[PDB]
Write a protein that binds this ligand. Structure first.
Ligand code: ETU
Length: 127
């Protein structure tokens, strides 16, 4: 089977704005998670062809990864911080859905998620 197209990261028809929350989501949240020791399987869309995961896209219908989230923040694709937070949550839950409790990839996702939740609990109030 083929991989689906990646999630859209840019759209010239969507309106754009700059907020302190979206700035914090790129500057603090994504930059911190990106450097984490267990971030590398989550830095690009799951390549089910190269990774030999033929049922991945039969089970995961809403794929999401940090490479996509970063490109969306860098392209001013998100209007609300909540859209970015939901993408981080979709990424984690996809991993828990496809994999099983105790799998190393799940342990890796759980560690990035705990860090994510710490940095999101310190999200600055909207200026
Ligand atoms: C479906 C799934 C997914 O959810 N995502 C998002 C992308 C990935 N993908 C497929 C699964 O990928 C994985 C990517 C990385 C790993 C880790 C597991 C832990 N570790 C080890 C462990 C023991 C060991 N002994 N000697 C070496 Cl060396 N090691 N290294 C490094 C590689 C596991 C699965």
């Amino acid at each position: 089977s083929m991989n689906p197209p990646p999630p859209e990261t840019s759209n010239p028809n969507k309106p754009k704005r700059q907020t302190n929350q979206l700035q914090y989501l790129l500057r603090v949240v994504l930059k911190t998670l990106w450097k984490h020791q267990f971030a590398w399987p989550f830095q690009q869309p799951v390549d089910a062809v190269k990774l030999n995961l033929p049922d991945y896209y039969k089970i995961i219908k809403t794929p999401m990864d940090m490479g996509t989230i970063k490109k969306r923040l860098e392209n001013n694709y998100y209007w609300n911080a909540q859209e970015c937070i939901q993408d981080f949550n979709t990424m984690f839950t996809n991993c828990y859905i496809y994999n099983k409790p105790g799998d190393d990839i799940v342990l890796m996702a759980e560690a990035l998620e705990k860090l994510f939740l710490q940095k999101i609990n310190e999200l600055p109030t909207e200026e």
